[PDB]
């Protein structure tokens, strides 16, 4: 199966941020943006794996899903990566990761030792949306400086999801396999 590890969002943030993504919209360029479901904080890209590895993975998830407290996080602000002359992901950001940065080191040195690819500096981020193609570049380095600094709200980090994305025509199709709440 295809997998991946992720923190999830809530509503107020959810409506939020979709709003955010209409203003955006598609004149300054061709987007493919995240459906509402589909908004999260990625932990880890895990590719294809097993069965079996998604229940060894489960068991280690757990161990460290315990080892941190539930907390509140402000999503804020407008990144692009990899740079603002080259743009390909728009992403919002996370108003102080460091537990959730924590976390994600700990997530990728443990699933590393099972063979699982480290990656590159871990940003916590919620991906608003993909850029195709650029048709107006004024337009959308004005457009998304303009929500540079953005306020989207807060939630709570109360839980880590083992998930299952299956690539349907139009949309990939995400399907929660375990869920970990955080202590108190
Ligand atoms: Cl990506």
Known sequence: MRAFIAIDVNES???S??????YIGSKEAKIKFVERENLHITLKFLGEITEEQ????????????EKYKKHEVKVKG???????????????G????????????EIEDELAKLG????????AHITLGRVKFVKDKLGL???????????????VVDAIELKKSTLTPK??????????????
């Open 141 to 155: 380095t004005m457009k998304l400086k303009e929500l540079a600094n953005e306020d989207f709200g807060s939630f």
């Open 94 to 105: 996370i108003e102080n990761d460091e537990i959730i940065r924590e976390m994600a080191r």
């Open 13 to 15: 943030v959810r409506d």
């Open 171 to 184: 949309g990939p199709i995400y399907e929660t396999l375990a869920r970990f709440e955080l202590s108190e």
């Open 17 to 22: 941020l979709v709003r955010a993504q209409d």
């Open 78 to 92: 407008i990144g692009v990566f990899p740079n603002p002359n080259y743009i390909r992901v728009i992403w919002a």
């Open 116 to 123: 699982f690819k480290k990656e590159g500096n871990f940003v």
């Open 54 to 65: 998604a229940e060894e993975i489960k068991n280690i998830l757990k161990k460290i899903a």
